[PDB]
Design a protein around this nucleic acid. Structure first.
Ligand SMILES: [Mg+2]
Length: 476
RNA sequence: AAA
């Protein structure tokens, strides 16, 4: 039996790719995968059903997982008659792992052995896995689905597949999309457009694919070629209909151009197809907020008459959708911050607070996103609740979690104004002392940082944070 | 899916 458990780990499939269930909302993934099967016909059905099966096992539904794996076998027979045996390895891997979890050891073995046989047949240098670009590609996609944390591992996976077939249409889409997301991940300030080239190439290799095209259009918006982008959008919309995975990215395009009504039209159309989508609900709320803001700016932050009436309607709508986004994807960090921010604007602080505090307890979202929550809660504390003590705290956490980001200077500027103010009132305010300590340390003003920590330590001598700072402050 |  220990021999079997050893062999399982050697297999190449979802069970050995470190896809941790904690890093996602299991229901959202299971749901959206289901929706991708119905409404994203470009993507591999065999891959989605292999992934679905694994997801279902993470939900503790091993019986349904097998059923999913059966669908895959049928798809293997259908789409991959030729190259049947080699397309079965991942499916067979999930089978062996799923049966092992159901304590059907004899059955689990039947699959590993079935996998072993195929490996020597096409003698790969490994006994229970065969390196393959299509599998590297499936790997890339599963990784992507498990969120921000996996993007680099995803990128590499596609890179491994493209190493073999640099001109494969499918492979290029995966890579291009991955680099496109990494353009929007862990930004330090300005926008990134490493993905522009790979998308160019992806599109050329996939002429009829409007899903890949929409990313090129958005990436062209990002780099101030809005004209070229919008023409790409118009071409797509006249070329496809009611494909939620395409309409929603066109909606985004229009939204940023401030064409909110046209964005709302496209979203709504995507919605009647896929009404539970957290993507769509977020984008909707964003449009209502923006429209709401446009009015406030046009009335110097104090609308009267039908304006105030409209603004309150927009707020309520934006709340409805942010909440929907949040309820559908418990891992959707910006669903929480936008919801709470809108509750704040609405003056329902109790609701703002409850949403923020849930967002502050998400352990497994990325540091970049943790960082944004600390930032927004900090502002809520400062401007709505007027608690400078609490805001200073959260600006510090934001920087501690991620110190180089487009928020860096908003955070250090805020910490400096607040700490100075509070120190003009009480020169012995410790939190404010360690605050300027931390910031000056961050800015490289090593001496001023030391002075601030020394004043802090004089007040709170055996503080292990201030002792640590002064030390590491002496170590350059 | 925010900036
Ligand atoms: Mg999603």
């Amino acid at each position: 039996k220990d021999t079997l458990k050893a062999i399982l780990l050697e297999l190449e499939c979802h069970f050995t790719w470190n896809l941790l269930k904690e890093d996602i909302d299991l229901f959202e993934v299971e749901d959206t995968i289901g929706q991708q099967l119905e409404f994203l016909t470009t993507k591999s059905r065999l891959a989605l059903y292999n992934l679905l099966a694994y997801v279902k096992h993470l939900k503790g539904q091993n019986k349904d997982a097998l059923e999913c794996l059966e669908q895959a076998e049928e798809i293997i027979q259908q789409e991959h008659s030729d190259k049947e045996e080699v397309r079965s390895l991942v499916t067979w891997g999930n089978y062996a792992w799923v049966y092992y979890h159901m304590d059907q050891l004899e059955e689990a073995q039947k699959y590993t052995g079935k996998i072993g046989n195929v490996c020597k047949k096409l003698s790969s240098p490994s006994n229970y896995k065969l390196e393959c670009p299509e599998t590297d590609c499936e790997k890339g996609w599963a990784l992507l689905k498990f969120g921000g944390k996996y993007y680099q591992k995803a990128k590499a996976a596609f890179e491994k597949a493209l190493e073999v077939e640099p001109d494969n249409p499918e492979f290029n889409i995966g890579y291009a999309i991955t680099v496109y997301r990494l353009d929007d991940s862990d930004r330090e300030g300005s926008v990134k457009s490493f993905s522009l080239g790979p998308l160019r190439k992806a599109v050329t290799l996939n002429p009829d694919n409007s899903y890949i095209k929409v990313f090129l259009a958005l990436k062209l918006q990002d780099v101030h070629a809005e004209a070229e982008g919008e023409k790409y959008i118009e071409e797509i919309l006249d070329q496809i209909s009611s494909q939620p995975y395409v309409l929603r990215y066109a909606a985004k395009f229009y939204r940023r151009k401030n064409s909110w009504n046209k964005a709302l039209e496209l979203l709504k159309k995507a919605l009647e197809v896929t009404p539970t989508s957290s993507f769509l609900h977020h984008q909707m709320g964003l449009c209502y907020r923006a429209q709401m803001i446009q009015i406030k700016k046009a009335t110097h932050n104090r609308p009267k008459g039908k304006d105030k009436l409209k603004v309150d309607e927009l707020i309520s709508s934006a709340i409805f959708h942010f909440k929907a986004a949040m309820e559908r994807d418990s891992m959707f960090a910006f669903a929480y911050t936008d919801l709470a921010n809108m509750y704040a604007e609405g003056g329902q602080y109790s609701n703002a607070e409850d949403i923020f505090r849930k967002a502050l307890r998400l352990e497994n979202i990325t540091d970049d996103h943790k960082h944004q929550i600390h930032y927004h809660y900090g502002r809520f504390q400062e401007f709505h609740r007027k608690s400078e003590n609490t805001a200073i705290h959260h600006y510090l956490e934001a920087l501690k979690v991620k110190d180089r980001s487009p928020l860096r200077t908003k955070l250090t500027s805020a910490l400096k104004k607040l700490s100075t103010k509070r120190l003009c009132h009480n020169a012995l305010d410790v939190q404010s002392l360690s605050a300027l300590g931390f910031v000056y340390k961050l800015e490289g003003e090593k001496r001023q940082a030391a002075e601030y920590y020394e004043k802090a330590q004089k007040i709170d001598p055996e503080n292990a944070e201030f002792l640590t700072a002064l030390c590491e402050l002496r170590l350059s």
